[PDB]
């Protein structure tokens, strides 16, 4: 099977949109999504969950899909109680100055919790925060950061969302010189502990700086690694080839181009993360569609491939992350030797 055959008579925009909305459930994403949903359903005291994925891995789409699935799951229940929001997700703001701004973070989190049924809450318990009466929640500039944090905590405990999503969580590490890195995460831990809402942090391998800051943080956080498809194992290479085959069969052209024959080039210019592969294939499909080309050629792919200088940095960062995120039996033996465990 593949793309619908009637799309060939459709204009270029419809075919481009169809390919844009298409997604592939490759095994790595399936495993990561299953683990993420299993953790979300029963956090069991875990204040944090950490999703470390490379650039182009697909973390953001994963967030959208889990948000949609959880909203669909909670939709039938909303008839009984109308004040419950299933999932809230906000992106972390990169600070303009040297310090991650928690006032703006709290403001954006509170804005994202706006609901048309304002009468159900009717009060946030802090002066300066109210409804704009038409479609918005307006916060005063005189409202101090602790007051905003208190209002956000009250709103969270009232709404009790299933999971609080923070995308691009590596922006929390944008802090001044000093040991303030641990405090950046301690504040979020305190917030999640008071509101009792599991916080999901998604980001690149720069998030490894938050991995094992302290004993408490390491205990109450769950590490989820979104591995790329490596070239050292036959299973990963075969999964990459299968993904390439699916994309070949699902891209709307008159004749399906042969891409599995150039799987090495695709891996070279994508490092195995299928999100970058999908993005590059979308680019080349649009390029071919603008001239109504019958098939994809190697020149068309090369005209929009990532530069090798870019991919060198991509691979350096990926290796740096993957070396830290790896574990062997030697680590287990070292742990138990340190412990009283005889083995």
């Amino acid at each position: 099977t593949g793309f619908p055959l009637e799309l060939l008579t459709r204009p270029a925009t419809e075919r481009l949109a169809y390919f844009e909305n298409y997604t592939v459930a490759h095994p790595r994403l399936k495993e990561v999504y299953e683990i993420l949903m299993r953790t979300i359903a029963e956090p069991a005291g875990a204040s944090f969950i950490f999703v470390y994925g490379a650039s182009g891995v697909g973390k953001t789409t994963l967030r959208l899909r889990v948000e949609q699935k959880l909203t669909e799951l909670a939709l039938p229940k909303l008839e009984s109680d109308r004040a419950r929001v299933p999932v809230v997700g906000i992106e972390a703001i990169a600070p303009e100055s040297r310090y991650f701004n928690w006032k703006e973070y709290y403001t954006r989190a509170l804005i994202t919790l706006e609901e048309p049924l304002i009468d159900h809450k009717f009060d946030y318990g802090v002066r300066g925060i109210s409804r704009d009466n038409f479609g918005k929640i307006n916060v005063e500039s005189k409202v101090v950061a602790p007051a905003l944090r208190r209002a956000l905590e009250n709103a969270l405990i009232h709404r009790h969302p299933d999971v609080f999503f923070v995308d691009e969580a590596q922006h929390f590490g944008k802090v001044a010189s000093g040991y303030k890195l641990q405090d950046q995460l301690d504040c979020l831990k305190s917030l999640a502990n008071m509101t009792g809402i599991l916080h999901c942090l998604l980001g690149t391998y720069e998030l490894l700086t938050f991995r094992n800051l302290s004993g408490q943080l390491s205990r109450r956080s769950v590490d989820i690694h979104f591995r790329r498809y490596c070239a050292d194992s036959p299973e990963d290479v075969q999964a990459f080839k299968s993904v390439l085959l699916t994309f070949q069969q699902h891209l709307p052209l008159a004749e399906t181009p042969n891409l599995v024959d150039h799987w090495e080039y695709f891996y070279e210019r994508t490092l195995g993360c299928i999100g970058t592969l999908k993005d590059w294939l979308k680019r080349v499909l649009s390029d071919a569609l603008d001239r109504e080309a019958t098939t994809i050629t190697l020149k068309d792919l090369q005209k929009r491939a990532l530069s090798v200088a870019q991919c060198q940095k991509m691979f350096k960062e990926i290796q740096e992350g993957e070396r830290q995120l790896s574990e062997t039996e030697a680590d287990v033996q070292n742990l138990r030797s340190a412990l009283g465990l005889g083995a």
Binding site: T1, Y22, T23, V24, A25, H26, P27, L29, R65, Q238, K241, S242, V243, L245, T246, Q249, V260
Partner: peptide, 7 residues
């Protein structure tokens, strides 16, 4: 080589 499914 397997035609995977949609997410």
């Amino acid at each position: 080589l397997v035609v995977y499914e949609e997410f």
